[PDB]
Design a protein around this ligand. Structure first.
Ligand SMILES: CCCCCCCCCCCCCCCCCC(=O)OC[C@H](COP(=O)([O-])OCC(O)COP(=O)([O-])OC[C@@H](COC(=O)CCCCCCCCCCCCCCCCC)OC(=O)CCCCCCCCCCCCCCCCC)OC(=O)CCCCCCCCCCCCCCCCC
Ligand SMILES: CCCCCCCCCCCCCC(=O)SCCNC(=O)CCNC(=O)[C@@H](O)C(C)(C)COP(=O)(O)O
Ligand code: SF4
Ligand code: SF4
Ligand code: SF4
Ligand code: SF4
Ligand code: FES
Ligand SMILES: [K+]
Ligand SMILES: [Zn+2]
Lengths: 176, 96, 263, 126, 114, 360, 208, 48, 95, 113
């Protein structure tokens, strides 16, 4: 249930002594190292051609956030603030009021993408699949406040990526 | 996988290993990126009878710790457990 | 003194005659679960959440209503007490709507909290639920009667404290609905306090509706100035903005109520 | 001997690293928090709490967030008795005010009182 | 009221340790101004040392001033060995901070703080 | 040339993690543990999960326990690749770094398939794992494991018999057994010095008593025996991963106590109790009965422990995090005496030191 | 209670209760309490004058041999007059067991340094100086280990705020990283999450 | 596609030289992929 | 149904627009105010009222477990429709 | 049989383990006689040291003595005897069989608070 690494007492017959001395004087293990490096010289490398080739992702991937809509145009967020109670970073700021037809809807849905730890507790705490953490990861900005999303930016990410987000949720929701 | 047999033999000679049987680049042996939908099973408490929660309440069987000594014969000296059994050397590969 | 000795889980307590089982367990620091019992309303005995085993007695008793007899050992944590609590919580969550995210009572609901504490964690209910028509009892109390668990604190408050006698139960059975039976506007001077004692989101505050949520509100204990009674209140705020005003209990002023002007 | 005698008042304000403004201008409030009247449970009335006076929260010009400058605006301390909280406030140099624990006085509950013969305490319905 | 001490038995040994720590800081200040190449004078840094010693002058507990001497030796050890940078030494001089309102009227004008 | 004293100044990544844990619930404080030993993410998840599940008096289902052991050994492969390749990269052997980070890249693809993040998964939770293994994942884990021994073999061909790698590691940083136990060393730091101790054998957790593996024991206490122990632990992790793939049971992956683990999303949108429990677990969180555990697991750097104190509420009262790297970097000063300055980078390499768990 | 409930280990509970009696009767000068948790962990709560005689016992005694110091911890509990709770976690590799040695101090009473028993403690209790402010007497190099060099206060004390009192920024006027009083653009939002219903009746404290 | 290339090389995009008014002959951008091809190219599915 | 202030700034679905004398319009100088032009209050008004022959209807928003928690709506009022609290789809008893 | 190595780094092979254990056990008992007879430490340590000394006197073979002393290698049994001797020499100076020096306060070990 255990083994002894490096507890080999070497042989002292003239065969093994001359083998070790030929290894010392003729550099056998150094040529073994050169052979392994030469072996990787003639291998096809593992380099994908980014941006033209992309690294493989799964439908569970947790990237850029997006507020979704029902298949009628109505937004799914019913202002229940579970995503900001569960948020380990307190990145989500929510303020709500009844809108002009009496629906429980948010007026403030902020996510600070520089507080966010991208762990997806908001999409798994959301009872109506409103906030999701979509598949976009290429959204680097040049300014800090461009990573401070309001409700307009998140609903635009939903409208921008819904054709992908709905298919990822369709592929994954029986594991959830 | 697209290596010609001259470079393939040179590469297998330089490594000392048959490299083509175990390629570190991945090809059509891997799983499909589109899978069929699963049917995940339910747990043991998904029953309609003999499923009262007071018979499976783990948090409410936690007791406060038993105070063994508090400041308000020829009995045997004890250890915190029996002594540890000496480990057996590996039958698989002991390096011996 | 004429105090009689009863036992709560073995521990002795001396009680005045007329003390209920619930108050006797209160005197040793155990709060028996309840939905219809309120210590400032009359005893209704009609939610059955306080069903508790007295030992050497093969029937659970309504702890809010049953007075203690001398020598009873109240088993608040025994097996059939917990089975009774889980059964009654199961019947309360049979026809109750899945409205917890769109409900103003979420996080401050008695039904959620003592469903987490004293009920089961899943449903055996495989049927369709009831849906109850909502009412319009004024511009203050938002009414969503599908959430009502029929505990009649409405009726006991509007009769006994508000002195209005205009809320009641119509119908019979599962079709029994708490309301005014007519398009009637329940505007007393204490009409907002039914938002307090309703344990569920059936009676919510129509100004406070949807704006906040209880865990994120800071509670500042303050004083009413809307009259010279000096009602103790909680100003609950959120991020530097006043969200609502609740009462504080003060036994000598406002017992646990406030007026509609204050609220 | 190996024990010294210090008959001075216990004061550790020079050791806690707290600046002067957040010692001598703050008013700690030692109180049992009231029961939320949204609920009937009483487990949040069991312990004493020490909080401080609220300072200014203003609007963030960029997002509308609640900006603060009070480090003690989220500091709530839990104490088992009133005297432990008073000792902890006096030890840290916090000027404090104490509100007494307001337990509810015991009620007189009678289910038969709902159905009396001559008293006003009858229920008109049930 | 019988407590276990830290180093000092009463206030006299405590003031002795305060005094030797003050001697060590007073000797160290020109070395600190040189090797951190601070833009203050030696007299300005010595006035800051006198200020940091007079800030805690109200303490009559021997254990509390023993801990103040211990933390002062720790700050001195972080100063002599170059463990602080120039920034940690100059944080004693609150130089980017605007001067706070002191009287009632200016505190009334700026805000709500007492 | 000699080293008379080594004073390591740390706190350059002290973030006050375990004070931030005190203001967040147990689920909310779970992703702080991914960020402590940031090359051993799911192992620290497993240690915190076992601490909370010990205090909750509940247990994971068997399939969740096998998933935790499978991904703990995948995590151990990740961490020992990081250990060996950066310890070689600092000395100068820069090439097996690039050779083994493709294998490490494929194991991050495994993490991303099973959780959605490549490093900080938040996948092993108190109650089980968050989500079940997607289809075709275990087949690809098998396809990885079928090839990975040859990668270890060519790593070992580049370093182990090399005389330059031996000269930088054989006489360097010798730790005796008594001073290893006295300095609070754990893992390979003990096992390189001859001490037959492994927490997966002695104080076993989830299903480690049902896997068969060996424990590599060094003989001289140096950098070279600790290197050989880490390489052989990659071998034995491949052995345990084969046993986990063959003995994976069917069933659920969370505990079926819906007052601890959240319900499925289909039944949360159907059942009343499930919606109440979903609400209360994602807003308040489950209450934990009051008590103090010290739950320690065998993380790939050593004994990773959590002294978790619960006051009876839904948030931790205290959460002390014992890291192996703290005691190892404390013992750095004894381990480097009498050595040269270029030996110190080998000694800092052979103690697998990651400063997130050192500093918290 | 098979599938979802943790199985109770009565054998280890009996063995740890017996060894707790053993330690309590060998060392009655300092042992104040001995308790065993329901998940079978032994705690020996001692007097702080016996930090060294207890720990040297458990490290050296042939029925104990707690040769490993796994962890050393303080816990700030402000409602006690001795608010700091020093926690030693010990591992016996011989008997495959763990013990917990708990003691107490306030801000001003020193605890004796246990580097004479476990040199592993050299940083740990030093961290207890840095985070909690507990002084350790006869320590080799007692100073800060994790906080910044000019840091005022002990952060893991529960009266210390979450964000500190100061924050850093670079200032180009003085060409220096400077410290200023902390202002947060968004305040940390405090969540009162505790339910008003009793969760665990076994842990009920008796009322006044 | 080229399914004889290894996994990672087997799918790629040659970006357009003009998208939304910007000349992208040399300024190719990874965010030029529309979301319907972003599943296929990142191998979240087999199906274009 | 996005509209426009006299400042030229677009008004969001909340109703948010800065005042003319508010300095914080300077953040949109040289840049744009990102608003979403799909107002959900107008898009759920476009949906027709579902005539059902039952007295109590159940709504889950479609998609089964991809919609919302399933709720039951009473249709005994004839003046008012039965609006779902989650998705805003409103129902009517046909008799 | 002259075991080549102990396996533990820094722990050398003891050439005469039996006489070394006998000397250390008699020296432990000789030091331990200076502790009062009512002390539980003396009773327990005399009991376990008499058991170990009788096992050492009852076995000529080294490896069988290792299996029935139940402490691993014989050299770490010797090391534990040295540690027990140093411990007992400290226990004489500490005198920990005395009564409890100070009661803790009334809610000192009350958890949760
Ligand atoms: C030695 C000198 C070079 C001799 C040519 C050579 O060795 O070619 C590599 C050729 C292919 O090697 P491989 O890596 O096994 O091929 C796999 C490829 O995937 C098979 O190739 P492929 O499927 O990728 O086919 C496309 C490839 C086809 O590959 C080529 O055209 C090879 C380069 C020819 C020059 O063409 C390109 O990629 C265009 C590259 C254009 C620039 C190449 C460098 C020019 C340097 C001089 C200026 O090597 C051999 O066939 C063995 C060596 C023969 C030596 C003969 C004596 C000289
Ligand atoms: C360049 C920047 C360098 C910054 C250096 C900061 C070092 C800070 C060290 C602070 C250490 C202390 O404050 S210990 C002082 C506490 N002492 C007391 O409370 C006792 C009162 N002390 C006194 O009255 C002192 O004036 C004397 C000299 C001890 C006695 O004077 P009295 O007689 O009249
Ligand atoms: S995004 Fe989801 S969880 Fe968050 S408030 Fe909206 S509906 Fe609730
Ligand atoms: S992914 Fe996590 S940190 Fe980010 S917004 Fe969601 S819950 Fe908050
Ligand atoms: S009243 Fe309570 S249980 Fe009912 S929907 Fe509202 S929060 Fe949920
Ligand atoms: S509306 Fe509320 S208070 Fe009135 S009977 Fe129903 S549950 Fe009780
Ligand atoms: S509380 Fe007694 S029955 Fe409702
Ligand atoms: K209500
Ligand atoms: Zn709907």
């Amino acid at each position: 249930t255990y083994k002894y690494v490096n507890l080999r007492e070497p042989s002292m017959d003239m065969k093994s002594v001359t083998d070790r001395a030929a290894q010392t004087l003729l550099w056998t293990e150094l040529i073994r190292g050169l052979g392994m490096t030469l072996s990787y010289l003639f291998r096809e490398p593992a380099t994908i051609n980014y941006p033209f080739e992309k690294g493989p992702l799964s439908p569970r991937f947790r990237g850029e956030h997006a507020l979704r809509r029902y298949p009628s145009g109505e937004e799914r967020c019913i202002a229940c603030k579970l995503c900001e109670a569960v948020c380990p970073a307190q990145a989500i700021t929510i303020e709500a009021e009844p809108r002009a037809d009496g629906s429980r809807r948010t007026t403030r849905y902020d996510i600070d993408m520089t507080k966010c730890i991208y762990c997806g507790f908001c999409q798994e705490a959301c009872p109506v699949d409103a906030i999701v953490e979509g598949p976009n990861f290429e959204f680097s900005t040049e300014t800090h406040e461009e990573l401070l999303y309001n409700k307009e930016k998140l609903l635009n990410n939903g409208d921008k990526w819904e054709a992908e987000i709905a298919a990822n949720i369709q592929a994954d929701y029986l594991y959830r | 996988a697209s290596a010609t047999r001259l470079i393939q033999g040179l590469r297998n000679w330089a490594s000392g290993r048959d490299l083509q049987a175990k390629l570190q680049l991945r090809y059509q042996e891997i799983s499909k990126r589109t899978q069929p939908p699963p049917k995940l099973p339910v747990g043991p408490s998904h029953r309609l009878s003999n499923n009262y929660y007071c018979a499976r309440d783990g948090r409410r069987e936690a007791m406060p710790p038993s105070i063994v000594m508090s400041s308000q014969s020829e009995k045997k000296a004890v250890s915190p457990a029996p002594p540890i059994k000496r480990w057996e050397l590996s039958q698989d590969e002991p390096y011996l | 003194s004429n105090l009689i000795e009863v036992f709560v889980d073995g521990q002795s307590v001396m009680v005045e005659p007329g003390t209920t089982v619930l108050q006797a367990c209160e005197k040793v620091g155990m709060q028996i679960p309840r939905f219809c019992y309120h210590e400032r309303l009359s005893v209704a005995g009609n939610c059955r959440m306080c069903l508790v085993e007295i030992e050497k007695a093969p029937k659970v008793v309504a702890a809010c209503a049953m007075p203690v007899m001398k020598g009873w050992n109240i088993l608040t944590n025994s097996e059939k007490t917990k089975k009774a609590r889980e059964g009654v919580m199961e019947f309360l969550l049979a026809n109750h709507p899945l409205d917890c995210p769109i409900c103003d009572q979420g996080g401050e609901c008695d039904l959620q909290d003592q469903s987490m504490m004293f009920g089961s964690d899943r449903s055996r209910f495989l049927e369709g639920k009831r849906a109850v028509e909502d009412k319009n009892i004024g511009p203050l109390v938002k009414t969503i009667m599908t959430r009502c668990i029929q505990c009649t604190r409405c009726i006991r408050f509007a009769s006994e404290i508000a002195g209005v006698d205009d809320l009641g139960t119509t119908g019979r059975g599962n079709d029994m609905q708490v309301g005014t039976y007519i398009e009637k506007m329940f505007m007393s001077e204490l009409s907002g306090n039914i938002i307090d004692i309703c344990p569920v989101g059936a009676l919510t505050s129509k100004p406070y509706a949807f704006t906040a949520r209880p865990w994120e509100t800071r509670k500042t204990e303050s004083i009413d100035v809307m009259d010279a009674v000096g009602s103790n209140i909680v100003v609950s705020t959120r991020t530097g903005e006043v969200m609502r005003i609740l009462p504080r209990m003060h036994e000598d002023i406002n017992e646990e109520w406030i007026s509609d002007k204050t609220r | 001997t190996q024990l010294i005698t210090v008959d001075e008042k216990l004061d550790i304000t020079t050791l806690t690293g707290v600046p002067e403004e957040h010692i001598k201008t703050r008013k700690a409030r030692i109180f049992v928090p009231a029961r939320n009247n949204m609920q009937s449970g009483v487990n949040n009335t069991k312990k004493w709490k020490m909080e401080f006076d609220t300072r200014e929260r203003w609007e963030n010009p960029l997002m509308g967030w609640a900006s603060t400058a009070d480090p003690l605006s989220n500091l709530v301390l839990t104490f088992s008795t009133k005297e432990d909280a008073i000792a902890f406030a006096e030890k840290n140099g916090w000027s404090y005010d104490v509100e007494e624990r307001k337990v509810p006085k015991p009620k007189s509950k009678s289910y038969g009182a709902n159905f009396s013969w001559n008293k006003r305490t009858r229920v008109s319905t049930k | 009221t019988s407590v276990k001490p830290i180093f000092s038995r009463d206030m006299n040994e405590a003031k002795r340790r305060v005094r030797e720590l003050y001697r060590a800081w007073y000797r160290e200040v020109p070395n600190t101004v040189h090797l951190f190449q601070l833009d203050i004078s030696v007299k300005q840094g010595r006035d800051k040392v006198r200020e940091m010693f007079k800030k805690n002058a109200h303490v009559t507990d021997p254990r509390v001033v023993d801990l103040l001497v211990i933390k002062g030796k720790m700050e001195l050890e972080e100063t002599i060995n170059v463990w602080k940078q120039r920034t940690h030494v100059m944080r004693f001089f609150h130089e980017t901070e605007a001067p706070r309102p002191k009287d009632f009227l200016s505190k009334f004008y700026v805000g709500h703080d007492p | 040339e000699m080293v008379r004293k080594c004073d390591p100044h740390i706190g350059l990544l002290h973030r006050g993690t375990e004070k931030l844990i005190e203001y967040k619930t147990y689920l909310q404080a779970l992703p702080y543990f991914d960020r402590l030993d940031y090359v051993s993410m799911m192992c620290n998840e497993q240690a915190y999960s076992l601490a909370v599940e010990k205090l909750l008096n509940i247990q994971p289902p068997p399939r969740a326990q096998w998933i935790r052991v499978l991904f703990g050994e995948i995590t151990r492969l990740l961490n020992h690749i990081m250990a060996v390749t950066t310890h070689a990269l600092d000395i100068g052997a820069m090439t097996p770094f690039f050779w083994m980070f493709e294998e490490r890249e494929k194991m991050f693809e495994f993490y991303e398939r099973v959780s959605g993040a490549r490093m900080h998964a938040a996948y092993v939770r108190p109650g089980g794992v968050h989500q079940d293994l997607p289809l075709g994942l275990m087949d690809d884990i098998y396809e990885f494991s079928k090839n990975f021994s040859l990668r270890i073999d060519e790593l070992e061909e580049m370093l182990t018999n090399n005389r330059i790698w031996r000269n930088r590691t054989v006489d360097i940083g010798v730790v005796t057994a008594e001073d290893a136990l006295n300095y609070g060393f754990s893992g390979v730091m003990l096992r390189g010095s001859g001490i037959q101790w492994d927490l997966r054998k002695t104080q076993p957790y989830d299903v480690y008593d049902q896997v068969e593996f060996d424990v590599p024991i060094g003989s001289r206490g140096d950098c070279y025996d600790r290197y050989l122990c880490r390489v052989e632990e990659m071998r034995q992790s491949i052995r345990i991963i084969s046993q986990c793939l063959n003995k994976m049971p069917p069933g659920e992956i969370k505990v079926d106590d819906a007052k601890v683990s959240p319900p499925k999303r289909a039944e949360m949108k159907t059942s009343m109790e499930s919606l109440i429990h979903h609400f209360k677990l994602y807003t308040e969180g489950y209450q934990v009965p009051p008590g103090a555990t010290y739950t320690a697991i065998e993380a790939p750097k050593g004994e990773f422990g959590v002294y978790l104190v619960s006051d009876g509420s839904s948030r931790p009262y205290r959460c002390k995090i014992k890291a192996p790297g703290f005691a190892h970097l404390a013992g750095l000063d004894k381990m480097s005496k009498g050595h040269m300055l270029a030996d110190v980078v080998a000694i800092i390499g052979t103690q697998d030191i990651v400063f997130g768990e050192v500093d918290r | 209670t098979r599938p979802t409930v943790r199985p109770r280990n009565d054998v280890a509970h009996k063995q740890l209760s017996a060894f707790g009696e053993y330690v309590a009767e060998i060392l009655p000068k300092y042992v104040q309490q001995v308790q065993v948790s329901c998940f079978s962990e032994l705690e020996i709560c001692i007097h702080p004058d016996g930090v060294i005689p207890v720990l040297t016992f458990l490290r050296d005694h042939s029925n104990a041999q707690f040769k490993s110091l796994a962890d050393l911890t303080a816990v700030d509990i402000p409602t006690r007059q001795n608010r700091f709770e020093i926690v030693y976690n010990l591992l016996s590799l011989r008997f495959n067991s763990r013990i917990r040695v708990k003691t107490y101090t306030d801000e001003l009473t020193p605890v004796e340094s246990s580097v004479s028993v476990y040199k592993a403690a050299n940083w740990y209790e030093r961290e207890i100086w840095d985070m909690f402010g507990v002084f350790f007497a006869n320590h080799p190099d007692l100073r800060r280990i994790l906080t910044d060099y000019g840091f005022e206060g002990h952060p893991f004390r529960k009266d210390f705020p979450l964000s500190g009192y100061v924050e850093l920024r670079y200032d180009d006027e003085v060409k220096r990283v400077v410290a200023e009083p902390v202002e947060l653009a968004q305040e940390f939002r405090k969540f009162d999450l505790n339910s008003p219903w009793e969760a665990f009746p076994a842990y009920r404290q008796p009322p006044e | 596609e080229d399914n004889k290339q290894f996994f990672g090389r087997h799918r790629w995009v040659i970006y357009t030289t003009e998208m939304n008014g910007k000349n992208t002959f040399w300024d190719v951008d990874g965010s030029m992929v529309p979301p319907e091809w972003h599943r296929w190219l990142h191998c979240m599915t087999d199906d274009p | 149904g996005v509209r426009t202030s006299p400042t030229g700034e677009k008004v969001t679905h909340t109703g948010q627009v800065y005042d003319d004398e508010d300095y914080r319009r300077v953040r949109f100088v040289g840049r744009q105010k990102e608003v979403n032009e799909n107002f959900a209050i107008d898009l759920i008004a476009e949906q027709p009222v579902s005539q059902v022959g039952s007295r109590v209807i159940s709504c889950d928003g479609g998609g089964g477990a991809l919609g919302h928690p399933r709720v039951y709506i009473n249709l005994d009022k004839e003046t008012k429709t039965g609006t779902c609290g989650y998705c805003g789809l409103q129902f009517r008893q046909q008799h | 049989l002259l075991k080549k190595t102990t396996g533990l780094v820094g722990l050398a092979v003891c050439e005469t383990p039996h006489e070394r254990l006998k000397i250390l056990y008699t020296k432990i008992l000789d030091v331990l006689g200076h502790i009062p007879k009512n002390a539980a430490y003396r009773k327990y340590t005399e009991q376990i040291t008499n058991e170990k000394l009788s096992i050492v006197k009852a076995e000529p073979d080294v490896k069988k003595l290792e299996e029935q002393l139940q402490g691993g290698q014989i050299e770490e049994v010797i090391l534990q005897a040295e540690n027990e001797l140093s411990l007992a020499r400290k226990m004489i100076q500490w005198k920990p069989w005395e009564p409890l020096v100070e009661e803790p306060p009334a809610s000192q070990w009350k958890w949760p608070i």
